Design a protein around this nucleic acid. Structure first.
Ligand SMILES: [Ca+2]
Ligand SMILES: [Ca+2]
Ligand SMILES: [Ca+2]
Lengths: 207, 207
DNA sequence: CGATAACGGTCCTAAGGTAGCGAAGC
DNA sequence: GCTTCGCTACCTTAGGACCGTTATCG
């Protein structure tokens, strides 16, 4: 339990990079979990319908389904639409991040670069996001969730189904169905480093 | 649904004040709920075992149990130690704020001064905090909570029992039991607005 | 006569939300 | 050759977490 302004020791940082490197190689998720609990000294959590409702309200507060569009020269067009699920939390709160990992049975917990002791859980694979993350929200979040977040969910889902149909491979599906969703979902349009400044700017670069 | 950078419009702000001004005059809480439901177009709710567990996760995320220590010239010792529970959310998520109100049966929703469109729900009445808020944390939160947050609950509760026994108007207990719990729960020590630099300074002032 | 309820104001990083690049793979 | 994985750095604001007075009330 580390206090405000107090940093994650560089060694624990080392070990985290290491145990993430390990699961990458062996794909032993079961061992990923074990590694984490020992590193962060985390008590077991059984995964019950109750702990899952707890998680669900935690994600309502703390999680984000977002979509980036960035330039990739080698890509079929100039650009790439890249969804992610992520949840942030200070180390003191890893127990709840660790709960998420067990429920989704996928994800990686990293240190948040630039932060003193902040951790982040991300799930970027599209199969994991359709099979694990989206059905979680529909099952345990949506009933209690706000209109803005419910829409967030249907839209992330729409995108992923598009991707299932190679609409990012096509061009009259991309510009007119994928990029829209990206634009409608931004919460930081106007950012300094922003991929693109508006819908059309990205549409007029798919071209 | 307000976009990033959209202020909550002034007609709503004014209407929220009349609504808070009305419940303070009448004490008709069911009616406060009705007014908020209609002001924000919120779907009226069953409080279930299920929606409580969801609120538990949300509060782990967005709620704060805090203790402030501040000069008050007219008080027995010139300073007051003051517990507060609050929960903050952008207006697009008022629906879960309404759920909290509905589960605690008390609290007030107000606009966060100086924000685009954020709202804060507060409970400061010490009987409410004892009879409603902590029991909720005990029944639904603490099982899934992080070690730090569990300990903040126990320490909040320890303060509330001290105040009930009047430790705050006995110099010794104020100095020796009350102030040290305040000090251990601090999260903003060294902020420019802080009422006391540190624990010693607060014990010295009281003496 | 006080305590404390009541409620606004203030601070400011831990949370949200993004983009980029090398390496690895249908 | 083009898409996806992993990890790192990045940017930006709604959250947390206080503090300051004045109304209320036994
Ligand atoms: Ca990615
Ligand atoms: Ca939060
Ligand atoms: Ca008070």
């Amino acid at each position: 339990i580390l206090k405000p302004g107090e940093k994650l020791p560089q060694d624990k940082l080392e070990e985290l990079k290491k145990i993430n490197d390990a699961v990458k190689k062996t794909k032993n998720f079961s061992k990923y979990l074990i590694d984490l609990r020992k590193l962060f000294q985390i008590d077991e959590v059984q995964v019950t319908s109750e702990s899952k409702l707890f998680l669900a309200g935690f994600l309502e507060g703390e999680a984000s389904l977002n979509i980036s569009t960035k330039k990739l020269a080698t890509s079929k067009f100039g650009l790439v639409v890249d969804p992610e699920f992520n949840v942030t939390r200070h180390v003191n709160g890893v127990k709840v991040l660790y709960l998420a990992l067990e429920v989704f049975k996928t994800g990686r917990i990293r240190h948040k670069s630039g932060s003193n002791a902040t951790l982040v859980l991300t799930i970027d694979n599209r199969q994991s996001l359709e099979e694990k993350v989206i059905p979680f929200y529909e099952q345990y979040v949506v009933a209690f969730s706000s209109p803005e977040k419910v829409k967030r969910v249907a839209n992330f889902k729409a995108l992923l189904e598009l991707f299932n149909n190679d609409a990012h491979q096509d061009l009259e599906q991309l510009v007119n169905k994928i990029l829209p969703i990206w634009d409608q979902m931004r919460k930081q349009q106007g950012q300094s480093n922003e991929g693109f400044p508006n819908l059309e700017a990205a549409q007029d670069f798919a071209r």
